[PDB]
Amino acid sequence: AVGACVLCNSQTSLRCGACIRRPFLCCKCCYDHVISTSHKLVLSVNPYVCNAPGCDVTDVTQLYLGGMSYYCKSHKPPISFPLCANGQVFGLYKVTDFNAIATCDWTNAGDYILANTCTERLKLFAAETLKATEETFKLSYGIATVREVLSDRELHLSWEVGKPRPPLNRNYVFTGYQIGEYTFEKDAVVYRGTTTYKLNVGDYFVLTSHTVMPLSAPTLVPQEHYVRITGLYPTLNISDEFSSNVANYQKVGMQKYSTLQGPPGTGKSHFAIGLALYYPSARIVYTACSHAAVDALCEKALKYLPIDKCSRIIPARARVECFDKFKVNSTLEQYVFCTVNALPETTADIVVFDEISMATNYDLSVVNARLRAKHYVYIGDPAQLPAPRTLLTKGTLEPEYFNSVCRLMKTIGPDMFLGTCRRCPAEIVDTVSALVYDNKLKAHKDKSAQCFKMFYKGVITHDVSSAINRPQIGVVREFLTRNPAWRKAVFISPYNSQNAVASKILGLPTQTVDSSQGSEYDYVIFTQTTETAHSCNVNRFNVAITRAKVGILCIMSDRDLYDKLQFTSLEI
Ligand SMILES: [Zn+2]
Ligand SMILES: [Zn+2]
Ligand SMILES: [Zn+2]
């Protein structure tokens, strides 16, 4: 009931009853809010509503202070004061950007632009409002119910009518009923339940709708620059293997927080684990939003750090199988590997937050609120993929607006940049260097002469909204017959339905561009499928072609990206 104004910090009893998150607004800011938005309900110790029996006047601009109570113009006594007047709303302790965040529906890109350009307190207000909006929207979808048990991995389903049916993709992890988190993918559909339980006919599932907690900590702590390495103890016996990062590790210890832009295969995980060998007594918490990003840090640590000082934090609700080689759930070990949403309340000498393009301002804040560290390291690449914004349907979200860390990397530049790609053949490195890295990314490898491109629009079919291009898969089939070494390639496309079709026709392992991020393969076969904003997205295209260590075949739909690929063209 008592607190500080989100816009000016002036103390108040006044909150907005029309905002989904009921923020405290001072007498001045509350007035500026109510008089320019449809938000007219104001909440003090008691709500600002007409106290006359049966009266439904709740608009603050139509209410007055009559004695110790509130009344409308129709019910107030002769000695009464308007609650709204003189640029202030009556309350104890006596804007444009706040209004827009408070009233938007989060379906436009401009909403996320504003949520990243505003003041720090407005960033938390926006992040809390957005996440609560996202969670409420999850209730709009309808409940599902098991129609039959086709086999151990397949089935056919039934829905409750009247409410919209969400898409069948590995993008919507539903929680099961308490029978583990289930997922779906394409009348013969596939039930993907992480927990091996015979799906009882009649049971139901609901979207993973977790309650949104308030944010208190900023997305980024205030920057502090030091003249000496603070609270960390370096070595001069630093392995030659990590010597290239020595100046950057010293930079880490001389600032409160630091940003590292690491293009694909430039050594992000090597840098993160090497930071532990450079400050060998430091307690490091390694965090990322996904279990995949956390497990990739676990694999690198397994090679350089002592296994007895590592612990993989796994929440009681075992969602998917993750890293099995560290002692599970020991918060006090020197090296703790844990996803953002599962972080314990602890302190650290260094916090390493990896895959920063996938973080939201909500995640940035959670880390600041759960971990109190001497140093914070943000590793990622704003030229890679951001977290999916399920409400966003209009406009494209540019990298400078992914989150606060990405905004800094795009506006003032990152503090550290890993300039040499060690993974990809030079054809790929040269293409992405010009496309998203302003020619600052260099190739370690020579050209492989196994990077091919083909311009083939094919035929686009749609599975509801997800796209398929059977002729592009047919072209891959013909290529495989003449290129048997490509037998072990991973098939990548921007669409789950295209991948399901390629999996049956080609028999190759499949991956969407979004799920390939952070992974690498000798050979990659990419079919663009369509020429939509989704399939032409430069960050997605960058991720797609940088998965390859040796060769890549790109079957393209977009002339622009096809011309930019510095690959040998194929005919047919
Ligand atoms: Zn104020
Ligand atoms: Zn409001
Ligand atoms: Zn009244």
Author numbering: 1 to 94, 103 to 185, 194 to 202, 207 to 592
Paper text:
The SARS-CoV-2 Non-structural protein 13 (NSP13) has been identified as a target for anti-virals due to its high sequence conservation and essential role in viral replication. NSP13 contains 5 domains, a N-terminal Zinc binding domain (ZBD) that coordinates 3 structural Zinc ions, a helical “stalk” domain, a beta-barrel 1B domain and two “RecA like” helicase subdomains 1 A and 2 A that contain the residues responsible for nucleotide binding and hydrolysis. A long 30 amino acid linker that does not adopt any secondary structure links the 1B to the 1A and 2A RecA-like core helicase domains.
648 crystals were soaked individually with a library of chemical fragments at a ~50 mM final concentration. X-ray analysis of the majority of crystals showed no bound compounds; however, 65 bound fragments were found within 52 datasets using the PANDDA algorithm. Some of the hits were found in pockets predicted to be of functional importance, including the nucleotide and nucleic acid binding sites (the bound fragment structures are be referred to by the corresponding PBD depositions). The screen identified over 50 binders with fragment hotspots in both nucleotide and RNA binding channels that can be used as starting points for design of novel anti-virals. Our analysis of the mechanism has also allowed us to identify fragments that may serve as possible starting points for allosteric inhibition based on their ability to interfere with or block structural transitions that form part of the catalytic cycle.
